[model samples]
Target: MTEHFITLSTTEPNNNIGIVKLRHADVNSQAIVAQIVENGQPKNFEGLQPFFCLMAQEVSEESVVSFDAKNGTLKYVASDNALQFVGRNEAYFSFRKQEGGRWIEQFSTRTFHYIVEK
Candidate 1:
C-alpha cells in the first residue's frame, strides 16, 4: 500500500466553489472515490439533494483528468487531475480507492474555508 494526498482549492470566479486535483502516482489499478463532510455530516448541495461524492473515470497513466462539480462533469486537463465542487466555510474532503471489494481512504484534506463571493 502507498500513501497519497489530494490537493484542494477554490475557484477565483466563484469563491464558493472548490476544485480537487489528483496525483498521478496516487491512482493505481483501482477506482477513485471522494466525499465532502461538513461539520461532521455529509455536505449537501442545492438542486442536487445528495452527499458530495465523486467517482472519476478510469485512471490512465497517460494523461490527467479531473471531476468538475460546477456542471457535474469530468474532463481532461493540461495539468494535474482536478475536481470542481461547491465549497463551504468549513469542511473535510476525503479521497479513497476501491480495491478488492473494499474502499480504502488515501487521505483527507485539512479543514478549509471558502469565501463565497458577493
Candidate 2:
C-alpha cells in the first residue's frame, strides 16, 4: 500500500465563501475528489462534487491547487486540471482518492467560517 497524506488550507474570497487549497504528499497527477457542506447542508447540492487531485512532484515547487467556491471550480494549474463545483458556501471540506477504480476517502478539513459583509 502506498502512503499518502493531504494538507489543506483555506481563505475567504468573499462573504460566505471560501477558497480551499490542497496539497498532497507521496502522490502526483492522481485522481482526487472534494466535497463541501455548509451548516450541515450540501454546498454543491449535487451528487458528490468532484475535482482533480494534484500535488507537487518536487519539493521546491508549490502545488498549484485551489478551489473557487463562488465559481464552483477547482483549478490545478500544475496539472492543467479544472473541475466544476455545484455551488458556493463556507463549510467543511472532505477529500477522497481514486485508486484502482475505487473511491478511498483520505481526509476531511474542519469547518471554515467566512467573514460575511455587513
Candidate 3:
C-alpha cells in the first residue's frame, strides 16, 4: 500500500474535479492546483475509468458533483443522492496518509455525504 493525500475542491469549471499537490503544513488549508474533467466523453488519460455510488446529500437540479481517484486516472461517477448533491453544492474530501502512497479515507461529511470510496 502507498500513502497519499486526497483533497476535495469546490472551485472549478462547474461539474469538474481538481487535483492538487500537498504540502506538509497544508494539512488544514489545502486547495486544488489542477482541474480534472470527469465526463469522459473525450479521452485524455487512457486508463481513466469511472465508478458510481450513492452519496448522502440533498441534491437539487442545480447540484453538480464529480469525482476522481488519486491511484489511477479513473474518474468514477456517483449515483442517486451522491450525483444529486454534487449537482447542488461544493464539497471536498480528505484522506489519512497510509504506507506506500496509499490513502485511507478519513472523515468527509458536510451538509451532505461529501465523500465516497474510490
- Best candidate, lDDT: 2
Ranked by TM-score, the better of candidates 1 and 2 is 1
Worst 10 residues of 2 by lDDT: 54-63
The digit string of per-residue lDDT tens for model 2 on 1-118 reads: 1211223333322233334333333144432233344444334323233333322222122232566454333433322222122222233344555679866545444544221111
Model 1 agreement with the true structure over 34-117: per-residue lDDT tens digits:
333334333332222112232332221221235444333222221222222222223334444567985555544344332211
Would you list the rank order by TM-score, best first? 1, 2, 3
Best-to-worst order by lDDT is 2, 1, 3
TM-score of each: 0.26, 0.24, 0.23
Stretches of model 3 off by over 4 angstroms after superposition: 1-74, 85-87, 96-118
Provide the clash count, candidate 2. 1
Off by over 4 Å in 1: 1-88, 100-102
What clash pairs does model 2 have?
Answer: 72-85
**Preferred candidate (lDDT higher): 2 or 3:** 2
- Per-model C-alpha lDDT, please? 0.32, 0.34, 0.29
Q: Which numbered prediction scores highest in TM-score against the true structure?
A: 1
